[PDB]
């Protein structure tokens, strides 16, 4: 509350560390469904169904331009990529499996870097 604060957690490296995580997600062999925005002209149903499209290149541009206020807004966009994937793709599909694999990969890096 006013003039009453928990001890200051050092967040000065968060930007660099989210960049490193994002690099590792970018270079994973199962990243290919997620590297670029879904083409809304060429994929029937996507525009109407997925209210907030997100992809790794969009996260990279947001990260590089100071559009994440803190490390949690960064995690929310990464998770959005996988949530969108599950919304549109069957689990038993190459893309559906890719999304589960990448979500697992991300959540481990996230816990190990920050928790």
């Amino acid at each position: 509350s006013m003039s009453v604060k928990k001890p200051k957690r050092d967040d000065s490296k968060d930007l660099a560390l989210c960049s490193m995580i994002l690099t590792e997600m970018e270079t994973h062999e199962d990243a290919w469904p997620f590297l670029l925005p879904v083409n809304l002209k060429l994929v029937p149903g996507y525009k109407k169904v997925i209210k907030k499209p997100m992809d790794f290149s969009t996260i990279r541009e947001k990260l590089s331009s100071g559009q994440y206020p803190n490390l949690e807004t960064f995690a929310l966009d990464v998770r959005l990529v996988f949530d969108n994937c599950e919304t549109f793709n069957e689990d038993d599909s190459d893309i559906g499996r890719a999304g589960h694999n990448m979500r697992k990969y991300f959540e481990k890096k996230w816990t190990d870097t920050f928790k």
Side-chain angles (χ1 to χ4, degrees), residues 1-7 9-12 14-114:
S1 72
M2 194 183 335
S3 306
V4 184
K5 291 305 168 322
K6 295 198 187 53
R9 182 202 168 251
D10 182 13
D11 67 344
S12 60
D14 288 358
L15 188 60
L17 283 155
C18 289
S19 180
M20 284 170 57
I21 296 165
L22 182 55
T23 296
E24 295 166 358
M25 277 194 311
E26 292 167 333
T27 61
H28 192 297
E29 71 162 297
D30 299 338
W32 59 265
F34 314 115
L35 294 174
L36 299 178
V38 175
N39 182 335
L40 300 179
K41 302 171 191 305
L42 301 184
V43 177
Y46 209 84
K47 191 167 199 294
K48 186 64 180 272
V49 173
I50 300 295
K51 301 302 178 179
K52 287 178 73 171
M54 189 48 60
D55 66 284
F56 297 166
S57 78
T58 303
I59 299 173
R60 169 74 69 193
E61 183 63 36
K62 285 182 68 172
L63 193 61
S64 292
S65 61
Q67 294 187 64
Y68 291 116
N70 54 56
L71 84 170
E72 302 304 334
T73 58
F74 169 85
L76 283 169
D77 266 353
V78 175
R79 291 170 182 143
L80 176 61
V81 172
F82 311 123
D83 293 347
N84 287 346
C85 183
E86 274 197 56
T87 293
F88 212 80
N89 295 266
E90 276 293 341
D91 295 343
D92 187 16
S93 68
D94 295 276
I95 292 170
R97 283 186 282 279
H100 290 290
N101 285 355
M102 294 298 306
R103 179 195 304 272
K104 187 86 178 176
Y105 192 70
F106 170 65
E107 290 305 344
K108 167 105 151 72
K109 301 282 184 183
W110 189 252
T111 294
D112 292 356
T113 303
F114 294 119

